[PDB]
Design a protein around this ligand. Structure first.
Ligand SMILES: [Zn+2]
Ligand SMILES: [Zn+2]
Ligand SMILES: [Zn+2]
Length: 264
């Protein structure tokens, strides 16, 4: 999948207000335009960095203007371009504190010898905790600790305009089980409790626009196809995070049961 949908092209676009989609057909990456430079939200696979840089350019944004790189979570499909872009731009990397060891080592937790899941190691300039505010110029994002998919998985909240009114955006960090081990030798200590706390947290947030590190988190392609001038922004769907977190919780139960049965 990493060399299929995850590397397939998608045309960059203005998603809402100062948030621009610059990812691929299978990995979501965002530029947030501020009055004092750009924030880059995530990157893609290590081999896709040039592609992401080209997408930023298609919008007329300058890679050189990136001041901050923020991470949702520290897996190679989101961190693959951090070392390269950080060195090129002098940007600072901001990430959840418990993902710092993963970022700085370039490894998958609980599977550290797996070179196919490695990525170029990168230093974290600011390690964030719940409620920390990251500001560049006119723009502030708030960190929310939503661990499970990774130990330092961070969901980022910010306010945008839709016409004259405020709308709340969440870059949800991911809540899938994916490659993680939940029992036996869990991927990290306390993983199960983290996931279940995160589903509850997500369902309690008041979020107008759900975003995520893969477009399938929020059905990006269907919304993009419906978008046009003089029609409501299809990315505004305030009920979506509750619905999505409910689906994630149901799949989590299925995987926990499957992995528990496999222990025998
Ligand atoms: Zn991941
Ligand atoms: Zn991912
Ligand atoms: Zn929070």
């Amino acid at each position: 999948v990493a060399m299929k949908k995850w590397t397939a092209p998608f045309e960059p676009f203005q998603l809402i207000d100062n948030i621009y989609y610059v990812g691929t057909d299978g990995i979501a990456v965002y530029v947030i335009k501020t009055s004092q430079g750009l924030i880059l939200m995530d990157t893609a696979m290590p081999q896709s960095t040039g592609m992401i840089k080209d997408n930023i350019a298609k919008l007329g944004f300058k890679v050189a203007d990136i001041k901050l790189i923020l991470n949702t979570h520290a897996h190679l499909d989101h961190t693959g371009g951090f070392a390269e872009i950080k060195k090129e731009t002098g940007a600072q990397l901001v990430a959840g504190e418990r993902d710092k060891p993963l970022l700085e080592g370039g490894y998958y937790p609980g599977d550290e010898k797996n070179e196919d899941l490695a990525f170029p190691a990168v230093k974290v300039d600011r390690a964030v905790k719940e409620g920390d505010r990251v500001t560049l110029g006119d723009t502030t994002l708030t960190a929310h600790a939503t661990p499970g998919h990774s130990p330092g998985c961070t969901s980022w909240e910010m306010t945008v305009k839709d016409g004259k009114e405020d709308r709340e955006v969440l870059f949800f960090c991911s809540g899938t089980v994916a490659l993680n081990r939940l029992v036996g030798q869990p991927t990290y200590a306390g993983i199960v409790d983290d996931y279940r706390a995160t589903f509850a947290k997500a369902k309690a947030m008041k979020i107008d626009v759900l975003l995520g590190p893969h477009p399938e988190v929020y059905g990006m392609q269907a919304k993009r196809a419906e978008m046009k001038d003089g029609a409501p922004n299809p990315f505004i769907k305030p009920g979506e995070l509750v619905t999505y977190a409910t689906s994630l919780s149901e799949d989590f139960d299925k995987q926990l049961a499957k992995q528990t049965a496999a222990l025998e």
